[PDB]
Amino acid sequence: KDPKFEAAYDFPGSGSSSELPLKKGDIVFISRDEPSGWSLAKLLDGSKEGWVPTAYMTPYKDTRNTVPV
């Protein structure tokens, strides 16, 4: 169970292969992130790891449905 994140910005495969093509509202695992601005995103099936811009991946609400009042 890696920390799940959610692509707040669509990520069209520009180079891909080393990248992790995502879309606004796609959810993957972040395995690590580099201060170059890229988080190593791994598909939520654990299929393929790739790089995706850090600012795109927002902490996905899994196991958390905190209802306020």
Residue owning tokens 């306020």: 68
Residue owning tokens 């598909």: 43
Distance CA(11)–CA(66), nearest Å, equals 28
Q: What is the DSSP string of the chain?
A: -PPEEEESS-B--SS-SSB--B-TT-EEEEEEEETTTEEEEEETTS--EEEEEGGGEEE--SS------
Q: What method was applied to determine this entry? A: NMR
Domains annotated on the chain, with CATH = 1-60 (2.30.30.40)
